[PDB]
A and B are shown apart, each in its own frame.
Chain A
């Protein structure tokens, strides 16, 4: 990930393949002018759960995570990105994609697998030691079967930011 300038006059990048962005922690709050194509190609791979080394004009390599993206309505194309400057030992609460594995002895019976929360907020994992996904077994489930927070495996020293009895994956009936 590479970028150029940073002023408040954005006519030089407007028409061009660029997205105006920012990175902050509690020291340096540097403004950007990164490539739209590159950010799109890469952000789709890494999302919020992943981070990437961003080298500015010349050479100042920095590890950063994606905080929030404010895309244009009408045309779904992104317009502004917010990066969070990663420390070394401790990160923030990260929303993790809740995916599914295997068929359900309820899905084939009459119903279907419904992931209520598509992303899950998790307390103090450790940066560069963040789960890129979240595999959840569904096979044990029938009709009326819910899976809460206190039913999900957390990869080494991770804690749940969400409520203990918050419904994550529920298998629903037909019609």
Chain B
């Protein structure tokens, strides 16, 4: 969810995924195919969805984190200063990045659990597995 302390406000720009493997931690994973701003509540939706589906275990790895402040329209204005810090927190996610990875659950127990999570996401995704050895 939100971060503990920081600077307050930010900016915005885009280009292809930097630090996001495929394996590590889990067996199966979920990968972004489009660039986006993944809201805090958007992840918190996916966690809850996958969490419920597995019942007991909690073997879900949330690789993405909302390390980004977004501002908003108090009511109308423009005549006046910079805008409200407290709209939402976001994680900039570029194609290739692993957002979520699952452990111990079966192939299908994961195909479906991720399918449900996809429906709570603002972008196209795909499920992944093994053969990713860069560093371990």
Scan residues 1-56 of chain B and give those whose CB is less than 8 A from a CB of chain A: 16-17, 20, 22-24, 33, 56
CB distance B136 to A112 under 8 Å?
no
Task: Report whether B103 and A95 are in contact in the complex, using a CB–CB cutoff of 8 Å.
Answer: no
Known A174-B56, A175-B58; judge A117-B16 contact (CB<8 A): no
Interface-located stretch among A11-19, A68-76, A128-136: A68-76
- Asked if B16 and A44 make an inter-chain contact with CB atoms under 8 angstroms apart, the answer reads no
Q: Is the CB of B57 within 8 A of A175?
A: yes
Task: Tell me whether B16 and A73 are in contact (CB under 8 A).
Answer: yes
Asked if B136 and A74 make an inter-chain contact with CB atoms under 8 angstroms apart, the answer reads: no
Chain B interface secondary structure, helix, strand, loop or mixed? loop
Check if A76 sits within 8 Å of B128, measured CB to CB.
yes
Contact of B134 with A by CB under 8 A: yes
Interface size classification for chain B: 20 to 34
Is residue B59 contacting chain A, with contact meaning CB distance below 8 A? yes
Which residues of B have CB within 8 Å of A121? 136
Look across to chain B and name the residue whose beta carbon is closest to the beta carbon of A95: B136
B96 within 8 A of A: yes
Q: Bound complex: CA of A121 vs CA of B136, how far in Å? A: 8
- Complex contact B104–A112 (CB within 8 A): yes
Asked if A151 CB lies within 8 Å of chain B CBs, one says: no
A27-64 interface with B by 8 A CB criterion: 44, 47-48
Contact B133 A112 (CB under 8 A): no
A174→B96 contact, CB < 8 A: no
Q: Is B56 a contact partner of A175 (Cβ separation < 8 A)?
A: yes
Residue among A68, A76, A113 facing the most chain B CB atoms (10 A cut-off): A76
Contact with B along A105-146 (1 / 0, CB 8 A): 000000011100111010000000000000000000000000
How far, in angstroms, from A113 to B27 measured CA to CA in the complex? Answer: 12
- Chain A CB within 10 Å, residue with most, of B22, B23, B96: B96
8 extra A-B contacts, CB within 8 A, seeds A73-B95, A119-B133? A70-B134, A73-B17, A73-B20, A74-B95, A74-B96, A112-B57, A112-B59, A118-B24
11 A-B pairs with CB atoms under 8 Å apart are: A47-B131, A68-B134, A73-B20, A74-B33, A74-B95, A95-B133, A112-B59, A114-B103, A117-B136, A172-B59, A175-B57
B: residues with CB less than 8 A from A are 16-17, 20, 22-24, 33, 56-59, 95-96, 103-104, 128, 131, 133-134, 136
Q: Which residues of A contact B (CB under 8 A)?
A: 44, 47-48, 68-70, 73-74, 76, 95, 112-114, 117-119, 121, 172, 174-175
3 shortest interchain CB distances as A-B pairs: A73-B96, A119-B136, A174-B56
